[PDB]
Symmetry: D2
Subunit: 336 residues, 4 copies
C-alpha cells in the first residue's frame, strides 16, 4: 500500500482521508489535528492514527483523553506522500518542511499556484503532474468549472467563457462567518480569481465574476461559452452525460435548487451524503448560435475529493492513463 | 416478518421506511406518493413498491416513466399495519379508509390527538398503545421534550416545566418557506401547544412558549424544571447518560451550535446523516434552588423515526416490554 | 395640483404615494387597501383619504375602527389619474374598470407588457408615453438595468449585453417566503424574462440569466456589455457620474455589499431609508477590448418610485422634456 | 447648552449624536472615527466636527479628502461630557484618559459594570447617576428587559423572573459575522449575563438563558414573571401603555414578527427608521395564578439611544426628576 498522510483533518481533509482509505492501492497511515475536539475523537473511532500539528500541543490531547500517535513530524517519516488540507496559506508554509523531509505532497486550491508551481485537475491535465513532486488540486469552484468546460473544449473548441459564480458564504459547520443577509462582490475588482485558476489546468480564454450570498449548501455557476464549432442542445447533453463526474438534473423532476440537489444527495447514501459530481440543470442548456448557456452547481465540501485520489496516482506514478485512475477512483467511491 | 406499508413517502415517511426495513422482525411492502418526482424514483431504487395516492394519478407516473404497483387501496391489502406520514390533517381523513379496510395504523404529530384518540411516546406511555388499533406518534418537538422530561419525572418528580422552543423555519429541502430574516412568535397567544401535546403522553404540569427563526437544521429547547427532590448536576448527568436516545454533548468539545451538532451526525454515518437522538449541552445543566435548567436541540426530520418503529411493536403486540423494543429498534438503527 | 389616486397601498404603492405627495404639481387624493391592518391605519396618519377595494368590505374596515372615504369606484371619480400598484395580474383586471370610468392609469412591472400595450422608463422612452392613456413602469430589475445600459448605449453603441441577476428572495416584511438556505435558478430555462422586459423600453440585444438567494435587502447585477466604440474606464465613470439616478460607490470606502449600501441609504435620511438610485461599484468597472464588465445593485422596493412620478408627467402631458421631469422629480424626492 | 462629545461614531454613536443634537439643552461639539470611510464623510454632511482617535491618522483622513477638526484629545477639550461608544473593552481603556482630563463620561453596555463602577437605566435607577462622574448605560437587551420589568416590579412586586433571550446574530451592516444557519447557545453555561446585568440597575431575582439565531433585525424576549400581588391581563396592559418607551402591538393588526415591527418603524418616520421603544405583543400577555408570561422584541441599534440622553442630564445635574428628563428626551426624539 502507498502510505498516505493527511495533514489537516478538516472539511476537505476528513473526506480525503476516507476516499484514500476506500481505494485498493492506498491506505491512510495518519491524519493530523491542532485541537482536541469531536473530529479528533471521530478520527480514532474511524480507525485512523491521530497525529498533532506541533509537539507542544500534544499535552492538550492527552488532557482531553484523546490517544495521540505522535506529531506531524513523526507522521511524515512514515508516508509515501502527504495530502495537505490545512487552511489557505499554511500549505505553502508546510512545503519547506515537506522538502526538508524529502516527502512529496498534494495541496488544495486555497494555496497559490506559483507557491506550488503546478496545478491539477484529473480530466484536464493529469499528465502534467505525473512523476512530479508537488501539485495543487484546484479549488472547489475551479474544479466545478473544469468538469464541464473541458469536455466542451474538446468537442466544440472554446473561444471564450464568461461565468458568474454565486458563492456560498460558509460551510455548514462554520457558524462564525457571514453574511447573514447580504450579497457581496468577491471581489469588486474584476475579473475574479476563478478565471486564472482555470487557466492553470485548462488553456482557454475565460473571465469570471463572483459574489457571496447567505447560503451554506452549494455554489452555483452561470456559464456562457462561445465555441468554434456550432453545437446543438442534444449534442451538449450527450457530452455531459458521457463525461465523468458530471450528472444532469431536472427542475421538472423536483431539483429546482441547491437545497433539493443536496436532498437528492442524501437519498444516494454515500459518505456524509456528499455530492462529488457536478450537476447541470438539463433545462438550462441553451444554444444561441455559437454560444452555449447553462447553469450548474458545486458541492464545495466534496467535489475536489476524487481529484485528490487521482492526484496521488499521478504524483507517485501509479497509473499513467488518467481515465484508468478516474474510473478506479469512482468505483471505490461509488461515484455516480 | 410483519409487513408494513408507508402512506406518504415524504420527509418523515422516507425515513420511517428505511428504519422499518432495518428491523429483523419487520419489512416494508410499499410506500405511497402523489407526484412523480425524484423521491418517487429513489423509492424504486431502494426496492420499495411504489403506490399512488388516488387512481386518477396513476397515469401521471406512467407518463413520467415511473413504474407503479397500484393505488393506496391496493397497498393496504398487502399490509399488517400502515404508518401514515401524510401532511397535517390528511391523516385524519385517511383514518376513515383505514377503518373501512380494518387495518391498524400509526399517525404523526401534525394530527390532532382528539381525532386519533391516543398518543404515543416509547419511554413514557408505550403500554397505552399495546394491542390497540390507532396511535399518534407525538411531534418532533414534543418527542424531544419527553425524551428528557420523562427520566426527570421518574427520578426527581416534576412539579412544573417552563420551556421556550426556538423553532427552525423550514426543513432543508423546503425552499418556498420563510422566514428569511425575522423572529416570529408561534403563536403570539400563550401558552403554546407543545405543553398540551406533552400531556397526551406524559402527565406533568408544563407551560411552553415558541418562536420561529431563520434556520433549517434543528429546533432548540430552553428547559426549566421545578422538581420535588432536588438532585445535583452529577445526578442529572447520570440520568441523561442512562436514558435511551438522549446524548450529552459539550461546547468545549466543539459542539457549540445546532450546525456543529449536525456535523457530528455526519461523522456518525447513519442513514441521511440523521440525528435520531436528543442532544443536551452538558455545560448547560444547572440546578438553582429546586429547579433544573438545561438546553437541548432536536433534529426534527428524524427524532420521531425510532418512535414509529416502537409504536409498531406495541400496536401489533410484538413486544410487551418497552425496553426490549427500544433496545431492538436502537440496535437495528445504529442508535447511540 | 393634479389629483392622483393610488390603487393598492402596498410595498410600492405606499412609496409611490409619498413621492407623488412631495411634488409641487401633484397631490394624492386617496390610496386603497383590501384589509384593515396597520398600513391602513398608517395611511390615515399620513393624511391620505383611505378607500376600500370592494364595497362589500366597507363594514369590515368600519368595525376594525378604520375610517374609510368610500370605495375604489368613489376614489377614481376624485382623480385625474390612478397609479395601480396591485399584485401581479390584478392590474390587468383593473384595466377594464379604468377604461369604463374613462381614467388614465400607470401600472407596475409585474403586469404583462402585452396586457398594457406600453412600457415606460423615464430616460429610455419617456416620449412613448407622452399623452397616452395606459403605461407600465418596468420592474425593479428592468429599471435597474436600463438606468446604466441606456447611457452606455447612448455613448458607445451597445452590440450585446449578457447579465446575471442575483435576486433577493423576499422583501424585508415578507416573512412567509423562502428560500432560507438555497440558490434557486429563476427560471432554469434560459434566457430569463429580464432581457425581453428591457426590450420593451430600450432597443438592444440582451440575454439575461437569474437566480434567487436568501437575502432581503437588494438584488445584485453582473453585467457584461460589448459596445461598438472602444470605451475606456475613465469615460464610463464620467458617463455614470453624469447619468441621473446612478451613483458610484466603492468597497474601499466601506461599501462592500448590499447591506453596507443600505446602511449608507439610512445615513441619507430620506423616506423609509430608501435607495432610489442604482449604485455601481466603481472598482468593478472593467474594459476588455470593446467589452465592459461592471456590477451594480438594486433597492427593489424603491428604484421604480421616481419612474412612476415621471410617468404621471408623461401621461398627463405636464412636461414634454424628460430631463425637466426627472430633475423635478429628483429635487422633490431629494435624490442624489 | 451642554457641549457633548461622541467618542466612537459607530452603530450606537451615530444615533446618539443625532438624539443629543435634537435636544434643546445640549449640542454635539464633535464625533470621532478611526478610519476614513463613508460614515466619516456622512458625519461632515450632517454638520458634525470630525475628530480622529490617533494623531498620525489625521494625515490619513486628510489624504482621503476628509476635513478633520483635530484629535480626540482636542475634541475632549471642547466638551462638558463625552459619550463613549467605542467597542467593548475599549471604554475601560479610554476611562484612564477621561480621568486624566477630568472629564465626566457615559459608557455603553458592552463595558463591564465593575470597570465603570455604576450602571444606568432612566426609569430604574436614574438617581444613582445624579451628579456622579461615570456611568454605564446597560446594553440593548438589559434595557429592553428593564423597560417592562421595572413597571411590573413597581405595580405587582417581582418575586422571580425567568427569561429566554433570542438574539440577532449581527447588525444589518455587519457582513462578516454569522451564523448563516444555526442556533448557538450564548453561552451554554447558564444562567446568561442578562440576569446579573439587570441587577446592576434593578433589584430583582432573575435568571436568563440566551441563544443566537440567523437574523439581523431585532432581538426577541420570552418573559415569565412570578409576582407578589395577583395581576390581571387588563391591569398589565394598562401598566405597559402608561409606561414610557413601551408600546403594545398586535399580530392580529399585521405585526406578527420582528420584520413587520421594523416595517411599522419605517412608517413612523423617525431617524434611520429606528424603533427606540420596546414593543410588547398584546396577545402574548398571559396570567396564570401569580405568574405573567409575555413576549417583547428589541431594536438593538436604538433602544439604548434615549437612555444616553437621560444619562447626560443625570450626570451633569441638568434635571433631577427622571420623569422630566424622560419626557423631554421623548419629545425631542419624537418617541411614542
Ligand atoms: N472549504 C471548502 O469547501 C474547500 C473546498 C476545496 C478546497 N478547499 C481548500 O482546502 C484547504 C483546506 O480547507 P478546509 O475547508 O478543509 O479547512 P478547515 O476545515 O479549516 O481544515 C483545516 C485543517 O487543518 C488543520 N490545521 C490547521 N493548522 C494546521 C497546521 N499548522 N498543521 C496541520 N494541520 C493544521 C486544522 O486542525 P484543527 O481543526 O484542529 O485546528 C483542520 O483540521 C484550503 O486550501 C481551502 O481553500 C476548501
Ligand atoms: N417535517 C418534520 O420535521 C416532521 C417531524 C415530525 C412529525 N411531522 C409530522 O409528520 C407528518 C408528515 O410531515 P412531513 O414533513 O413528512 O410531510 P411531507 O414532507 O410534505 O410529506 C407528506 C407525504 O405524503 C404524501 N401525500 C400527500 N397527500 C397524500 C394522500 N392523500 N395520501 C397519501 N400520501 C399523500 C406526499 O406525497 P407527494 O410528495 O408526492 O405529494 C408526501 O410524500 C405531519 O403530521 C407532520 O406534522 C413532521
Ligand atoms: N415587490 C417589489 O419589490 C416590487 C418592486 C417593483 C415593482 N413591483 C411590482 O409592483 C406591483 C405590486 O407589488 P407590491 O410588492 O407592492 O405588492 P404588495 O406589497 O402585495 O401590495 C399590493 C397592494 O394592493 C392591494 N390590493 C390587492 N388586491 C387589490 C385590488 N383588487 N384592488 C386594490 N388594491 C388591491 C393590497 O391591499 P391589501 O394589502 O389590503 O390586501 C396591497 O396594498 C406588482 O406588479 C410588482 O411586480 C414590485
Ligand atoms: N451593536 C449594538 O447593537 C449595540 C447596542 C447597544 C449597546 N452596544 C454597546 O455599544 C458599544 C459600541 O458598540 P457599536 O455597535 O456601536 O460599535 P461599532 O459600530 O463598532 O462602533 C464603534 C466606534 O468606535 C470607533 N472606535 C474604535 N476604536 C476607537 C478608539 N480607540 N477611540 C475612539 N473611537 C474608536 C470606531 O471608529 P471606526 O469605525 O473608524 O474604526 C466606531 O466608529 C459597545 O459597548 C457595545 O457593546 C452595542
Amino acid at each position: 500500500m502507498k502510505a498516505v498522510a493527511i495533514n489537516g483533518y478538516g472539511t476537505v481533509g476528513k473526506r480525503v482521508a476516507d476516499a484514500i482509505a476506500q481505494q485498493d492501492d492506498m491506505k491512510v497511515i495518519g491524519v493530523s489535528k491542532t485541537r482536541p475536539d469531536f473530529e479528533a475523537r471521530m478520527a480514532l473511532k474511524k480507525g485512523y492514527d491521530l497525529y498533532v500539528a506541533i509537539p507542544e500541543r500534544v499535552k492538550l490531547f492527552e488532557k482531553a483523553g484523546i490517544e495521540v500517535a505522535g506529531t506531524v513530524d513523526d507522521m511524515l517519516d512514515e508516508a509515501d506522500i502527504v495530502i495537505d488540507c490545512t487552511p489557505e496559506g499554511i500549505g505553502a508554509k508546510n512545503l519547506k518542511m515537506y522538502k526538508e523531509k524529502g516527502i512529496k505532497a498534494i495541496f488544495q486550491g486555497g494555496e497559490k499556484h506559483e507557491d506550488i508551481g503546478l496545478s491539477f485537475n484529473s480530466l484536464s491535465n493529469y499528465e502534467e503532474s505525473y512523476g512530479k513532486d508537488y501539485t495543487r488540486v484546484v479549488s472547489c469552484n475551479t474544479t466545478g468549472l473544469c468538469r464541464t468546460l473541458k469536455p466542451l473544449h474538446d468537442s466544440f473548441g472554446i473561444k471564450k467563457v464568461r461565468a458568474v459564480i454565486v458563492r456560498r458564504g460558509a460551510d455548514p459547520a462554520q457558524v462564525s462567518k457571514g453574511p447573514i443577509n447580504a450579497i457581496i462582490p468577491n471581489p469588486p475588482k474584476l475579473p475574479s480569481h476563478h478565471g486564472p485558476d482555470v487557466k492553470t489546468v485548462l488553456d482557454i480564454n475565460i473571465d469570471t465574476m463572483a459574489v457571496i450570498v447567505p447560503t451554506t449548501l452549494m455554489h452555483q455557476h452561470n456559464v456562457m461559452v462561445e465555441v468554434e464549432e456550432t453545437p446543438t442542445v442534444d449534442d451538449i447533453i450527450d457530452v455531459f452525460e458521457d463525461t465523468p463526474r458530471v450528472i444532469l438534473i431536472s427542475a421538472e423532476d423536483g431539483l429546482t435548487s441547491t437545497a433539493e440537489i443536496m436532498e437528492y444527495a442524501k437519498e444516494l447514501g454515500r459518505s456524509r451524503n456528499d455530492l462529488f459530481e457536478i450537476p447541470v440543470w438539463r433545462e438550462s442548456i441553451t444554444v444561441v448560435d455559437n454560444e452555449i448557456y447553462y447553469m450548474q452547481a458545486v458541492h464545495q465540501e466534496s467535489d475536489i475529493v476524487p481529484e485528490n485520489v487521482d492526484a496521488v496516482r499521478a504524483i507517485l506514478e501509479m497509473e499513467e492513463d488518467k481515465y484508468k485512475s478516474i474510473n478506479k477512483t469512482n468505483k471505490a467511491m461509488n461515484i455516480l
